[PDB]
Amino acid sequence: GSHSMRYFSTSVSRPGRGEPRFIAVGYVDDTQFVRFDSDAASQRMEPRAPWIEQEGPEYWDEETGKVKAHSQTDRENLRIALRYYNQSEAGSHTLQMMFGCDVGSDGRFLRGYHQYAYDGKDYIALKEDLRSWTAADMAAQITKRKWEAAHVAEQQRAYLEGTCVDGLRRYLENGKETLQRTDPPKTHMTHHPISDHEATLRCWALGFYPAEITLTWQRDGEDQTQDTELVETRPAGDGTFQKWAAVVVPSGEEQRYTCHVQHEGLPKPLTLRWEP
Amino acid sequence: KPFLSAWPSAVVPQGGHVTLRCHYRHRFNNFMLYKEDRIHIPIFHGRIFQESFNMSPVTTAHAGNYTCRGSHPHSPTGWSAASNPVVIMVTGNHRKPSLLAHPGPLVKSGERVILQCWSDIMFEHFFLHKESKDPSRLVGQIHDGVSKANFSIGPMMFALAGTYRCYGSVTHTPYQLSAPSDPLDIVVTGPYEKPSLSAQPGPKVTLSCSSRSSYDMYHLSREGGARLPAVRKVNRTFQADTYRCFGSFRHSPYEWSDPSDPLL
């Protein structure tokens, strides 16, 4: 199916509390495989998944070099941002970068991302054409002009279509039995009396991978998209995910509601009805 | 461990202002300070600093290698662990040295540059500091009646460009630096595209560098050393008003474009 590779980087400045901190994580789909912390002792790109441990030392040296270069770069971009927004040098600020690519079942490129954010707001983003930049505010237009002058979008386009998708295919191959193995959601239902006239029905889904899943409640057929309560798909801690949906039902109409679960690992969507 | 910091800098002139802040237990709580000569002995007769320690006016005795400990009452020992070491160096003691750029302050991106700090005074320690973390250090080498050093800076990136100064210390008072040498600005050229050079009326005078890129400022220089804001033309082109010129962006004065082609 359609797979993805992402890199997320966070640079934070803590005046008086510590040194600037750079944490970087690499994900393929929903499985993290690399991390780099500027506060750990190794100072090297560390593996966080078994299917990537099989790479040679040339790989880790190259990746550690590039991620430490990014560490220094974003550490300085914090200071440059201080002057872009004329901010005090005593406040704490955040700089985030999301980079990556998508491929399809054909193994060919689909979409590439290279975006930045400052203090949680969008900063500069790479358009899907991979040739122009979207600057949110004025400070981002400054960077956009510098970047158009350095011909960076061309280099990024070469990298997004070149090393990025080739590496993504290699990652999907090296852990085929890990990343291309879907796990079905195990489902059950719980019933709790909200009061004498109404109760709450909760349909669970545990131990599913990837984290994509759909839980929908239906009363006599039609959906309750607004009468339902959804929580965020949460990790179990072992590469599987959990989710549940809860709807409040009048006491006696429990037979009129039902929950439908749709997931990639399920050959056919599941219909669950609550019985005493 | 606590975190020890110096505001505004650990390189402070005498009579200036400096402040040691000790962050422990998510607070600038009460702390005790220590020097390297007396590791397990608190300074100032075991003074417990309620607020942060402002060392202004900064004197000579105020320099050295410090570490703090915060108050952890619910622990075996009454205090924390040893914090990160912080070296306060006071400047303005001896005479200023000299700082030269070899081959020049206009460094090409990814290339190297040697900042040579020298003086007739046989300074034993030479220190190089960019105008904002821990400074670099090299021992002075005596030759031809003067002490010199060769600070290598590179490969050139936007983070390594800025105002550099270099200081000298005597053999038995290392934390007391000489006066700051004259500030040397090291600017990086590139990777921004080079502009085009033109000088009405002709080469027989007013600057005029044009480029499609919206450079905020054009800088000009000839073979011998001896700013200029820009504006767009009707062709949207940003023009200005052996010669060479560079393009620069506002708030980024130490990062220039590639050199324009040399013109007669």
Binding site: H70, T73, N77, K146, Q155 | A159
Partner: peptide, 8 residues
Amino acid sequence: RYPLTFGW
């Protein structure tokens, strides 16, 4: 593979 990042 980690990208190539540039200064702001």
